[PDB]
């Protein structure tokens, strides 16, 4: 039977530490994204891009529409890798790992975290863009010419099922830490200390999900099954990017 003992209080302090660090690293949280999407915020109402005309008018608030949108997508990804790297530094034990392994964990991790957290900004209609100032519809993205039309669709399909788990920011802060500390990334030098951190993060995640979700007893198992489906999303995503690079950022340049 579950007890509030020293071990559980340390897992709760670890959960609080990751949450606090999550709030510092990521400007738009799920709590705020959900208040925007549900119209329960006093903050400015996002501009909706639902057709070509609203996109032209919206670019106000490269020659071809599909390629300008792909370029915004690519630049936001650079920013996202920086936020995730800043969060990774706050995970206890992470900065103590071989720097080469810190780089490998983030290199193979950031895409899975990007699509986990993008689900927070998605509903059935579309996705919040430019830190919650715009909203771009799923059907408008899907309307873009091949091969751009199918770029975001698998992320929406993932988000529909992922969002039905109803995770909050407290849940996601630990879940993203579990993803980063994956001992199975290729070319890791020293696996054991990564799995030791992951074990403690899995314990903290299980406890989090039991306290926070009284109505889904196997939510822990269900969340681990998703880390499996994120792999496949990232595979298809990398494949589509290779296709686009063969067929068609200020900080990168420096």
């Amino acid at each position: 039977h579950m007890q509030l003992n020293p071990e559980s209080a340390d897992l709760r302090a670890l959960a609080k530490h990751l949450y606090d660090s999550y709030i510092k690293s990521f400007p738009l949280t799920k709590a705020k994204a959900r208040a925007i999407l549900t119209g329960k915020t006093t903050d400015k109402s996002p501009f909706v891009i639902y057709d070509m005309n609203s996109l032209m008018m919206g670019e106000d608030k490269s020659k071809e529409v599909a390629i300008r949108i792909f370029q915004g997508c690519q630049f936001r990804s650079v920013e996202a890798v920086q936020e995730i790297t800043e969060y990774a530094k706050s995970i206890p034990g992470f900065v103590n790992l071989d720097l080469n392994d810190q780089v490998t964990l983030l290199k193979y991790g950031v895409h899975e975290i990007i699509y986990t957290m993008l689900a927070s900004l998605m509903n059935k209609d579309g996705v919040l863009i430019s830190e919650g100032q715009g909203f771009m519809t799923r059907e408008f993205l899907k309307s873009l010419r091949k091969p751009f039309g199918d770029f975001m669709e698998p992320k929406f399909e993932f988000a529909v099922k992922f969002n039905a788990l109803e995770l909050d920011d407290s849940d996601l802060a630990i879940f993203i830490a579990v993803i980063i500390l994956s001992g199975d990334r290729p070319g890791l030098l020293n696996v054991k200390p990564i799995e030791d951190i992951q074990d403690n993060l899995l314990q903290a995640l299980e406890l989090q999900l039991k306290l926070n979700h009284p109505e889904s007893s196997q939510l822990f198992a269900k969340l681990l099954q998703k880390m499996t489906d994120l792999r496949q999303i990232v595979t298809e995503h990398v494949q589509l990017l290779q296709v686009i690079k063969k067929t068609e950022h200020p900080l990168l340049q420096e």
């Binding site: 650079v78 890798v81 920086q82 790297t85 800043e86 780089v103 290199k107 950031v110 990168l252």
Partner: peptide
Amino acid sequence: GLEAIIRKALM
């Protein structure tokens, strides 16, 4: 180029 961004952000 993913490594480039990560190494810089870790510094």
